[PDB]
């Protein structure tokens, strides 16, 4: 039975789209999630919506309670999580407005708990060393890629996201350096969200929309909040459409072996006395 | 009305130089600054002096209250901040004793709050994503460069500072890696000082004096505290002279458009509910 | 008088090997070490054995009390520390089971105290900026290399360890990036252990045993806890044999000048008011 957690879903919380809408404020061993969980059916698939920075956005990416968010989604029975994120492009070929179905990350965060198994929570006892060779769920990504093609969307089938601590944007020297490291897009939220989802045995995938060229690129306006917001206003409809069309495809795909292997990977990553 | 905050201005607290001296301890919403603020006029420009690691004090760069320092300077009405820092050279051409008017940074810090807008201070509400394409005030840097030329100083008109967490110096593998990333000089304090100044709408620039070659030469003597102190004793007079001669040039330059654009950049970087 | 601290010392706590075995639970100004100190003589050299993650314990590398561990060893009179660590190989030529006598590191940790001189401790007043040009004791490394050759062990005479925060393993994009930085092996514990040992004036060296190829081969099976444990089970004796044969060579080598220079380096790295 699939249940899809949706983070950043802007704007699936719509009475025309979400049937049987119900709201829930949960607590977790790691504190309160960023917002209420919004439950319902989208195209007859059970979904759980969670706004990442709250309903009226008051949280720097550094302070988002990623642990509580993922724990809550796991506790609701989510088998999948699909997230949407804006990002900067570090490659000429990834133009603003393009979607990138990211398949790797590079962590540049510093302040962030990245495990449930922190020695202080008896619902997550021991030490977990989760594999990150393939951080994003391949089958979900394939569906996203296929669906984007059908919709005629500008879409890149792979990409490496560098997640910076923020909340500042990168310097130009940083932007150039990230390019030499192999990063293709840049954001502030993929890590540790993706890591925690893997620990929880959840199939996680990300829809990244490029909104700017960061500040590496000749002749473009360098990134700012207004440049990001402007591109999202002109393009964010694309991510919503991609998600809407993807959800029922996930609902009608077979998952038991994928989910079993994720469960095993998570279980056998934990060391006990 | 220009007012120049000066960090690491050691020798400017001199009765021959600083007229109308007052000392005071300020408190801020982010705690106490590193030292008392010393107010006065240098060459008929209002200045505010602030020792970065305390007057005598024993504080690692990781633990300097950068937020309080910049907030305090902002609250005193500082329009500009000019800082002096020692640094290691990562380039043969940047010799010990040389000044570098840095124009970029690479952040290698991990422990450091880099924003005033942390969700816990009602004088800095919301989330701020400050642009860092050009972290240092161009007009102040131009004055510094011009003044250094007039003084006959060996001075590099640009350079990328990598700021490490410290307090340890870098390994040789780190030193070589920083060179490959495009870093030219290395220190422990530029980040997050530069970032916070930009959030506060302050024109920030840095005078970096090379004191050593870090450890990327295998044949040459590596950096140590004694090597740094020795070079500063033999050269620090240069940074003082540069600052002294720069201050009245800043006092007599037009700033209203520069400061307006900084104010706008800072204001429109803030997201609210 | 040499005394060798041994961290991760794979089966040296054996009544056939360790003469005069004594167990001791110590406290330090930085808290409790990871396990009891086990004191005794191995081949007539005073040794102090310390398990890094505890005897029956389960603690993330982020939370190991490295300060207490090194302080305790220093307080017992250790002149040398030899550590064993598992690691991932980032180079084809470093095969699982191979030993690497590492000579450099790259720090990718974020959460970790790296100094005793933190402004809050009795025995460690001031600020310490320890040189890290040569983090590992050259003479100990030479003995390790020579001894490995005599034993017929597959052994690499140098290597750069990248230490990641963990507890997660690296992504494939991270693994590839570390290769481009010049890292040869990867672990979670070298930093800050090596840094703190240098601050304490201790001759520190590391025996790294490769257990996997991380995840930088796309065709090959990526690292997991089970893959690491399997390789360790298959390679259980090598590090012990190397250490056993190395210990008396360290005992019969001259150290007074090496230790004097380490003491001086540590002492003159400290700044006071
Ligand atoms: C199609 C996804 C829509 C969901 N959504 C809404 C928003 C609100 C936008 C607030 S602007 C600041 C955000 C954007 N966000 C991503 C981003 C874009 N460009 C970047 C760059 N050059 N460097 C680093 N990060 C970025 C970072 C910041 O939190 N973000 N994602
Ligand atoms: C030009 C006037 C500067 C004023 N002033 C005095 C002092 C006292 C310095 C105490 S020595 C340790 C400091 C130096 N300082 C800069 C530095 C120099 N070389 C570096 C290198 N290779 N790697 C990293 N950082 C450095 C870092 C340390 O806190 N610092 N600034
Ligand atoms: C077969 C019994 C041996 C007893 N035993 C258990 C242990 C604990 C090992 C648990 S596995 C996870 C550890 C390994 N250890 C080193 C390591 C190896 N490969 C790495 C890689 N690719 N990336 C980062 N680190 C590593 C890190 C982690 O704590 N050590 N000795
Ligand atoms: Cl983001
Ligand atoms: Cl880094
Ligand atoms: Cl510094
Ligand atoms: Cl290779
Ligand atoms: Cl390790």
PDB file of C-alpha atoms in Angstrom, chain B residues 16-236:
ATOM      1  CA  UNK B  16      48.504  60.954  18.854  1.00  0.00           C
ATOM      2  CA  UNK B  17      46.032  59.371  16.344  1.00  0.00           C
ATOM      3  CA  UNK B  18      42.619  58.959  18.008  1.00  0.00           C
ATOM      4  CA  UNK B  19      41.013  62.244  19.155  1.00  0.00           C
ATOM      5  CA  UNK B  20      38.113  62.393  21.629  1.00  0.00           C
ATOM      6  CA  UNK B  21      38.624  58.831  22.888  1.00  0.00           C
ATOM      7  CA  UNK B  22      35.765  57.106  24.714  1.00  0.00           C
ATOM      8  CA  UNK B  23      35.608  53.429  25.726  1.00  0.00           C
ATOM      9  CA  UNK B  24      32.432  51.435  26.358  1.00  0.00           C
ATOM     10  CA  UNK B  25      30.987  47.958  26.835  1.00  0.00           C
ATOM     11  CA  UNK B  26      27.865  47.395  24.754  1.00  0.00           C
ATOM     12  CA  UNK B  27      25.426  44.499  24.881  1.00  0.00           C
ATOM     13  CA  UNK B  28      23.539  43.224  21.840  1.00  0.00           C
ATOM     14  CA  UNK B  29      20.689  40.775  21.186  1.00  0.00           C
ATOM     15  CA  UNK B  30      23.469  38.272  20.211  1.00  0.00           C
ATOM     16  CA  UNK B  31      25.486  38.762  23.421  1.00  0.00           C
ATOM     17  CA  UNK B  32      28.608  40.703  24.269  1.00  0.00           C
ATOM     18  CA  UNK B  33      31.150  41.797  21.651  1.00  0.00           C
ATOM     19  CA  UNK B  34      34.755  40.552  21.892  1.00  0.00           C
ATOM     20  CA  UNK B  35      35.891  43.765  23.574  1.00  0.00           C
ATOM     21  CA  UNK B  36      34.790  47.274  24.481  1.00  0.00           C
ATOM     22  CA  UNK B  37      34.108  49.655  21.611  1.00  0.00           C
ATOM     23  CA  UNK B  38      36.646  52.515  21.448  1.00  0.00           C
ATOM     24  CA  UNK B  39      35.107  55.636  19.856  1.00  0.00           C
ATOM     25  CA  UNK B  40      36.871  58.706  18.479  1.00  0.00           C
ATOM     26  CA  UNK B  41      38.026  60.689  15.464  1.00  0.00           C
ATOM     27  CA  UNK B  42      40.961  59.697  13.294  1.00  0.00           C
ATOM     28  CA  UNK B  43      41.939  62.393  10.787  1.00  0.00           C
ATOM     29  CA  UNK B  44      38.519  64.000  11.422  1.00  0.00           C
ATOM     30  CA  UNK B  45      36.508  60.846  10.561  1.00  0.00           C
ATOM     31  CA  UNK B  46      34.356  59.186  13.230  1.00  0.00           C
ATOM     32  CA  UNK B  47      35.723  55.699  13.933  1.00  0.00           C
ATOM     33  CA  UNK B  48      34.782  52.788  16.207  1.00  0.00           C
ATOM     34  CA  UNK B  49      37.637  50.427  17.120  1.00  0.00           C
ATOM     35  CA  UNK B  50      36.971  46.812  18.101  1.00  0.00           C
ATOM     36  CA  UNK B  51      39.663  44.245  18.971  1.00  0.00           C
ATOM     37  CA  UNK B  52      38.581  40.899  17.493  1.00  0.00           C
ATOM     38  CA  UNK B  53      40.008  38.446  20.061  1.00  0.00           C
ATOM     39  CA  UNK B  54      39.767  40.826  23.063  1.00  0.00           C
ATOM     40  CA  UNK B  55      42.305  43.398  24.336  1.00  0.00           C
ATOM     41  CA  UNK B  56      44.483  40.724  25.987  1.00  0.00           C
ATOM     42  CA  UNK B  57      42.005  37.769  25.939  1.00  0.00           C
ATOM     43  CA  UNK B  58      42.377  34.133  24.875  1.00  0.00           C
ATOM     44  CA  UNK B  59      39.608  33.350  22.361  1.00  0.00           C
ATOM     45  CA  UNK B  60      39.814  30.948  19.415  1.00  0.00           C
ATOM     46  CA  UNK B  61      38.498  32.264  16.065  1.00  0.00           C
ATOM     47  CA  UNK B  62      35.677  29.670  16.319  1.00  0.00           C
ATOM     48  CA  UNK B  63      34.312  31.307  19.489  1.00  0.00           C
ATOM     49  CA  UNK B  64      34.535  35.025  18.563  1.00  0.00           C
ATOM     50  CA  UNK B  65      31.025  36.496  18.792  1.00  0.00           C
ATOM     51  CA  UNK B  66      30.979  37.826  15.227  1.00  0.00           C
ATOM     52  CA  UNK B  67      27.224  38.505  15.380  1.00  0.00           C
ATOM     53  CA  UNK B  68      27.618  40.709  18.466  1.00  0.00           C
ATOM     54  CA  UNK B  69      30.664  42.456  16.978  1.00  0.00           C
ATOM     55  CA  UNK B  70      28.940  43.438  13.718  1.00  0.00           C
ATOM     56  CA  UNK B  71      25.618  44.224  15.451  1.00  0.00           C
ATOM     57  CA  UNK B  72      27.428  46.549  17.886  1.00  0.00           C
ATOM     58  CA  UNK B  73      29.190  48.363  15.052  1.00  0.00           C
ATOM     59  CA  UNK B  74      25.884  48.687  13.157  1.00  0.00           C
ATOM     60  CA  UNK B  75      24.179  50.037  16.304  1.00  0.00           C
ATOM     61  CA  UNK B  76      26.914  52.684  16.697  1.00  0.00           C
ATOM     62  CA  UNK B  77      25.999  53.937  13.193  1.00  0.00           C
ATOM     63  CA  UNK B  78      28.915  52.439  11.270  1.00  0.00           C
ATOM     64  CA  UNK B  79      28.522  52.845   7.528  1.00  0.00           C
ATOM     65  CA  UNK B  80      31.832  51.101   6.817  1.00  0.00           C
ATOM     66  CA  UNK B  81      33.897  48.347   8.395  1.00  0.00           C
ATOM     67  CA  UNK B  82      37.565  47.907   7.541  1.00  0.00           C
ATOM     68  CA  UNK B  83      39.276  44.899   9.023  1.00  0.00           C
ATOM     69  CA  UNK B  84      42.893  43.875   9.171  1.00  0.00           C
ATOM     70  CA  UNK B  85      43.878  40.219   9.282  1.00  0.00           C
ATOM     71  CA  UNK B  86      47.078  38.193   9.090  1.00  0.00           C
ATOM     72  CA  UNK B  87      46.988  35.319   6.611  1.00  0.00           C
ATOM     73  CA  UNK B  88      49.026  32.559   5.029  1.00  0.00           C
ATOM     74  CA  UNK B  89      50.008  32.855   1.384  1.00  0.00           C
ATOM     75  CA  UNK B  90      49.009  30.036  -0.967  1.00  0.00           C
ATOM     76  CA  UNK B  91      50.811  31.658  -3.946  1.00  0.00           C
ATOM     77  CA  UNK B  92      54.560  32.195  -4.508  1.00  0.00           C
ATOM     78  CA  UNK B  93      53.923  35.757  -5.741  1.00  0.00           C
ATOM     79  CA  UNK B  94      52.176  36.725  -2.463  1.00  0.00           C
ATOM     80  CA  UNK B  95      55.242  37.067  -0.264  1.00  0.00           C
ATOM     81  CA  UNK B  96      55.220  37.467   3.506  1.00  0.00           C
ATOM     82  CA  UNK B  97      54.781  41.182   4.263  1.00  0.00           C
ATOM     83  CA  UNK B  98      52.568  41.711   1.189  1.00  0.00           C
ATOM     84  CA  UNK B  99      49.094  43.171   1.538  1.00  0.00           C
ATOM     85  CA  UNK B 100      46.160  41.574  -0.267  1.00  0.00           C
ATOM     86  CA  UNK B 101      42.941  43.512  -0.785  1.00  0.00           C
ATOM     87  CA  UNK B 102      40.808  40.385  -0.951  1.00  0.00           C
ATOM     88  CA  UNK B 103      37.720  40.254  -3.185  1.00  0.00           C
ATOM     89  CA  UNK B 104      36.427  36.711  -2.648  1.00  0.00           C
ATOM     90  CA  UNK B 105      36.278  34.010  -0.029  1.00  0.00           C
ATOM     91  CA  UNK B 106      35.911  30.260   0.257  1.00  0.00           C
ATOM     92  CA  UNK B 107      34.222  29.139   3.489  1.00  0.00           C
ATOM     93  CA  UNK B 108      35.837  26.179   5.277  1.00  0.00           C
ATOM     94  CA  UNK B 109      34.307  27.049   8.677  1.00  0.00           C
ATOM     95  CA  UNK B 110      31.861  24.681  10.350  1.00  0.00           C
ATOM     96  CA  UNK B 111      30.849  26.034  13.784  1.00  0.00           C
ATOM     97  CA  UNK B 112      29.740  29.551  12.949  1.00  0.00           C
ATOM     98  CA  UNK B 113      26.414  31.383  12.877  1.00  0.00           C
ATOM     99  CA  UNK B 114      26.405  33.380   9.621  1.00  0.00           C
ATOM    100  CA  UNK B 115      23.094  35.265   9.842  1.00  0.00           C
ATOM    101  CA  UNK B 116      21.336  37.678  12.162  1.00  0.00           C
ATOM    102  CA  UNK B 117      17.984  36.302  10.944  1.00  0.00           C
ATOM    103  CA  UNK B 118      17.961  33.107  12.996  1.00  0.00           C
ATOM    104  CA  UNK B 119      14.254  32.973  13.996  1.00  0.00           C
ATOM    105  CA  UNK B 120      15.076  33.835  17.657  1.00  0.00           C
ATOM    106  CA  UNK B 121      15.652  37.606  17.593  1.00  0.00           C
ATOM    107  CA  UNK B 122      12.718  39.958  17.012  1.00  0.00           C
ATOM    108  CA  UNK B 123      15.083  42.755  15.773  1.00  0.00           C
ATOM    109  CA  UNK B 124      15.992  40.408  12.893  1.00  0.00           C
ATOM    110  CA  UNK B 125      12.719  38.701  11.920  1.00  0.00           C
ATOM    111  CA  UNK B 126      12.300  36.449   8.858  1.00  0.00           C
ATOM    112  CA  UNK B 127      14.920  34.555   6.802  1.00  0.00           C
ATOM    113  CA  UNK B 128      17.742  36.375   5.029  1.00  0.00           C
ATOM    114  CA  UNK B 129      19.503  35.007   1.941  1.00  0.00           C
ATOM    115  CA  UNK B 130      22.188  37.626   1.331  1.00  0.00           C
ATOM    116  CA  UNK B 131      23.948  37.690  -2.069  1.00  0.00           C
ATOM    117  CA  UNK B 132      27.685  36.977  -1.894  1.00  0.00           C
ATOM    118  CA  UNK B 133      28.685  37.315  -5.582  1.00  0.00           C
ATOM    119  CA  UNK B 134      30.671  40.395  -4.534  1.00  0.00           C
ATOM    120  CA  UNK B 135      31.248  39.986  -0.765  1.00  0.00           C
ATOM    121  CA  UNK B 136      33.554  43.007  -0.297  1.00  0.00           C
ATOM    122  CA  UNK B 137      32.654  46.659  -0.901  1.00  0.00           C
ATOM    123  CA  UNK B 138      34.189  47.580  -4.311  1.00  0.00           C
ATOM    124  CA  UNK B 139      34.587  51.325  -3.656  1.00  0.00           C
ATOM    125  CA  UNK B 140      36.369  50.801  -0.325  1.00  0.00           C
ATOM    126  CA  UNK B 141      38.632  48.234  -1.968  1.00  0.00           C
ATOM    127  CA  UNK B 142      39.469  50.704  -4.776  1.00  0.00           C
ATOM    128  CA  UNK B 143      40.471  53.335  -2.186  1.00  0.00           C
ATOM    129  CA  UNK B 144      42.579  50.766  -0.314  1.00  0.00           C
ATOM    130  CA  UNK B 145      44.296  49.701  -3.554  1.00  0.00           C
ATOM    131  CA  UNK B 146      44.945  53.299  -4.634  1.00  0.00           C
ATOM    132  CA  UNK B 147      46.244  54.266  -1.192  1.00  0.00           C
ATOM    133  CA  UNK B 148      48.595  51.252  -1.020  1.00  0.00           C
ATOM    134  CA  UNK B 149      50.028  52.272  -4.417  1.00  0.00           C
ATOM    135  CA  UNK B 150      50.633  55.845  -3.146  1.00  0.00           C
ATOM    136  CA  UNK B 151      52.351  54.480  -0.035  1.00  0.00           C
ATOM    137  CA  UNK B 152      54.685  52.323  -2.170  1.00  0.00           C
ATOM    138  CA  UNK B 153      53.402  49.094  -0.582  1.00  0.00           C
ATOM    139  CA  UNK B 154      53.611  45.642  -2.133  1.00  0.00           C
ATOM    140  CA  UNK B 155      49.903  45.060  -2.548  1.00  0.00           C
ATOM    141  CA  UNK B 156      47.756  42.611  -4.506  1.00  0.00           C
ATOM    142  CA  UNK B 157      44.569  44.177  -5.855  1.00  0.00           C
ATOM    143  CA  UNK B 158      42.513  40.973  -5.578  1.00  0.00           C
ATOM    144  CA  UNK B 159      42.590  37.575  -3.918  1.00  0.00           C
ATOM    145  CA  UNK B 160      40.494  34.727  -2.618  1.00  0.00           C
ATOM    146  CA  UNK B 161      40.634  34.073   1.111  1.00  0.00           C
ATOM    147  CA  UNK B 162      39.903  30.563   2.348  1.00  0.00           C
ATOM    148  CA  UNK B 163      38.710  30.793   5.956  1.00  0.00           C
ATOM    149  CA  UNK B 164      39.355  27.639   7.964  1.00  0.00           C
ATOM    150  CA  UNK B 165      37.678  26.760  11.268  1.00  0.00           C
ATOM    151  CA  UNK B 166      40.921  26.477  13.193  1.00  0.00           C
ATOM    152  CA  UNK B 167      42.375  26.857  15.656  1.00  0.00           C
ATOM    153  CA  UNK B 168      44.815  24.348  14.111  1.00  0.00           C
ATOM    154  CA  UNK B 169      46.702  25.252  10.974  1.00  0.00           C
ATOM    155  CA  UNK B 170      46.034  23.288   7.806  1.00  0.00           C
ATOM    156  CA  UNK B 171      47.571  19.970   6.834  1.00  0.00           C
ATOM    157  CA  UNK B 172      49.778  19.943   3.718  1.00  0.00           C
ATOM    158  CA  UNK B 173      47.089  17.961   1.819  1.00  0.00           C
ATOM    159  CA  UNK B 174      44.603  20.686   2.770  1.00  0.00           C
ATOM    160  CA  UNK B 175      47.019  23.443   1.706  1.00  0.00           C
ATOM    161  CA  UNK B 176      47.511  21.863  -1.732  1.00  0.00           C
ATOM    162  CA  UNK B 177      43.775  21.285  -2.129  1.00  0.00           C
ATOM    163  CA  UNK B 178      42.980  24.946  -1.321  1.00  0.00           C
ATOM    164  CA  UNK B 179      45.444  25.991  -4.053  1.00  0.00           C
ATOM    165  CA  UNK B 180      43.572  23.771  -6.566  1.00  0.00           C
ATOM    166  CA  UNK B 181      40.272  25.376  -5.485  1.00  0.00           C
ATOM    167  CA  UNK B 182      41.577  28.866  -6.387  1.00  0.00           C
ATOM    168  CA  UNK B 183      42.352  30.131  -2.870  1.00  0.00           C
ATOM    169  CA  UNK B 184      45.212  32.649  -2.692  1.00  0.00           C
ATOM    170  CA  UNK B 185      45.424  33.344   1.034  1.00  0.00           C
ATOM    171  CA  UNK B 186      44.245  31.575   4.183  1.00  0.00           C
ATOM    172  CA  UNK B 187      42.931  32.740   7.548  1.00  0.00           C
ATOM    173  CA  UNK B 188      40.498  31.967  10.377  1.00  0.00           C
ATOM    174  CA  UNK B 189      38.251  35.081  10.642  1.00  0.00           C
ATOM    175  CA  UNK B 190      36.979  36.479   7.301  1.00  0.00           C
ATOM    176  CA  UNK B 191      33.883  34.258   7.377  1.00  0.00           C
ATOM    177  CA  UNK B 192      31.378  35.006   8.837  1.00  0.00           C
ATOM    178  CA  UNK B 193      32.419  38.625   9.541  1.00  0.00           C
ATOM    179  CA  UNK B 194      32.055  39.593   5.862  1.00  0.00           C
ATOM    180  CA  UNK B 195      28.654  37.868   5.574  1.00  0.00           C
ATOM    181  CA  UNK B 196      27.175  39.528   8.666  1.00  0.00           C
ATOM    182  CA  UNK B 197      28.412  42.980   7.568  1.00  0.00           C
ATOM    183  CA  UNK B 198      26.593  42.536   4.232  1.00  0.00           C
ATOM    184  CA  UNK B 199      23.382  41.545   6.034  1.00  0.00           C
ATOM    185  CA  UNK B 200      23.680  44.714   8.155  1.00  0.00           C
ATOM    186  CA  UNK B 201      24.061  46.875   5.010  1.00  0.00           C
ATOM    187  CA  UNK B 202      27.613  47.884   5.905  1.00  0.00           C
ATOM    188  CA  UNK B 203      30.375  48.573   3.359  1.00  0.00           C
ATOM    189  CA  UNK B 204      32.947  45.917   4.389  1.00  0.00           C
ATOM    190  CA  UNK B 205      36.526  45.529   3.218  1.00  0.00           C
ATOM    191  CA  UNK B 206      39.578  43.668   4.382  1.00  0.00           C
ATOM    192  CA  UNK B 207      43.301  44.331   4.549  1.00  0.00           C
ATOM    193  CA  UNK B 208      45.025  40.953   4.614  1.00  0.00           C
ATOM    194  CA  UNK B 209      48.742  40.805   5.378  1.00  0.00           C
ATOM    195  CA  UNK B 210      50.583  37.617   4.404  1.00  0.00           C
ATOM    196  CA  UNK B 211      52.748  36.364   7.277  1.00  0.00           C
ATOM    197  CA  UNK B 212      53.875  32.945   5.989  1.00  0.00           C
ATOM    198  CA  UNK B 213      53.489  30.445   3.153  1.00  0.00           C
ATOM    199  CA  UNK B 214      51.250  28.043   5.123  1.00  0.00           C
ATOM    200  CA  UNK B 215      52.929  24.598   4.502  1.00  0.00           C
ATOM    201  CA  UNK B 216      52.570  23.933   0.754  1.00  0.00           C
ATOM    202  CA  UNK B 217      56.306  24.364   0.164  1.00  0.00           C
ATOM    203  CA  UNK B 218      57.927  21.039   1.189  1.00  0.00           C
ATOM    204  CA  UNK B 219      61.448  22.563   1.402  1.00  0.00           C
ATOM    205  CA  UNK B 220      60.536  25.804   3.264  1.00  0.00           C
ATOM    206  CA  UNK B 221      59.723  26.283   6.943  1.00  0.00           C
ATOM    207  CA  UNK B 222      56.032  25.782   7.605  1.00  0.00           C
ATOM    208  CA  UNK B 223      53.766  28.196   9.410  1.00  0.00           C
ATOM    209  CA  UNK B 224      53.745  28.392  13.207  1.00  0.00           C
ATOM    210  CA  UNK B 225      52.566  30.999  15.697  1.00  0.00           C
ATOM    211  CA  UNK B 226      56.168  32.261  16.089  1.00  0.00           C
ATOM    212  CA  UNK B 227      56.645  32.639  12.316  1.00  0.00           C
ATOM    213  CA  UNK B 228      53.400  34.655  12.101  1.00  0.00           C
ATOM    214  CA  UNK B 229      54.308  36.915  15.057  1.00  0.00           C
ATOM    215  CA  UNK B 230      57.811  37.489  13.683  1.00  0.00           C
ATOM    216  CA  UNK B 231      56.507  38.648  10.273  1.00  0.00           C
ATOM    217  CA  UNK B 232      53.908  40.908  11.924  1.00  0.00           C
ATOM    218  CA  UNK B 233      56.589  42.538  14.109  1.00  0.00           C
ATOM    219  CA  UNK B 234      58.689  43.164  10.993  1.00  0.00           C
ATOM    220  CA  UNK B 235      55.713  44.417   8.875  1.00  0.00           C
ATOM    221  CA  UNK B 236      52.504  45.323  10.773  1.00  0.00           C
TER     222      UNK B 236
END
